[PDB]
Ligand binder design. Structure first.
Ligand SMILES: [Cl-]
Ligand SMILES: [Cl-]
Ligand SMILES: [Cl-]
Ligand SMILES: [Cl-]
Ligand SMILES: [Cl-]
Ligand SMILES: [Cl-]
Ligand SMILES: [Cl-]
Length: 195
């Protein structure tokens, strides 16, 4: 694999990202949906022995970027605390993520274009099986707030080649357009993780 073609080196790395595969994404991004249907799960499963799969949501995209970040931060922290993989059938994050992708991209739902955040939140929480009250309580927790703080770094990473942005060890950003297969992507991630 070749620097400049398959990947690039971030001039400002994502901090505290040792042994991670970070995926910067947005619920509102059609390619994020496409790659999450086709490559994200299989590839992350293949490399789970070397790098921890670590979604980073980009809060600045779409009318409900902030709300989606809140829902995802809450659900990822809950899944992690329960020792549940983010690709597991029982992952609440996974359920919410695909509910938003289906609503936004397949059904063209826009929840009144920013003016109905309660409806947007409901879509994700209902799919995840979480109550509004539980979400509101969980959002106040330090770990959830820490996650939201970490994800602020998504904006500067997204500038390079858009979203999705798959990053190895906070340093090596894969060029999404170069990804040709599950195997090749997993091969690349392993090479990058050995650097
Ligand atoms: Cl779109
Ligand atoms: Cl994800
Ligand atoms: Cl759409
Ligand atoms: Cl609605
Ligand atoms: Cl819109
Ligand atoms: Cl900036
Ligand atoms: Cl091979």
């Amino acid at each position: 694999f070749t620097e400049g073609t398959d990947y690039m080196v971030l001039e400002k790395p994502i901090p505290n990202a040792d042994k991670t595969l970070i995926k910067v994404f947005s619920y509102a991004c059609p390619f994020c949906y496409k790659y999450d249907k086709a490559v994200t799960g299989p590839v992350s499963e293949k490399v789970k022995d070397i790098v921890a799969f670590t979604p980073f949501h980009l809060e600045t995209k779409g009318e409900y970027g902030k709300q989606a970040s809140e829902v995802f931060a809450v659900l990822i922290n809950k899944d992690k605390a329960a020792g549940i993989s983010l690709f597991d059938a029982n992952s609440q994050f996974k359920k919410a993520k695909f509910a938003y992708y289906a609503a936004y991209h397949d059904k063209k739902e826009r929840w009144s274009d920013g003016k109905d955040p309660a409806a947007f939140i409901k879509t994700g929480l209902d799919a995840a099986g979480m109550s509004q009250a539980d979400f509101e309580a969980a959002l106040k927790e330090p770990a959830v707030q820490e996650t939201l703080e970490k994800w602020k770094a998504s904006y500067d990473v997204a500038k390079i080649q858009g979203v999705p942005a798959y990053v190895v060890n906070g340093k090596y950003l894969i060029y999404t357009k170069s990804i040709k297969s599950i195997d090749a992507m997993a091969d690349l991630i392993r090479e990058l993780a050995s650097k």
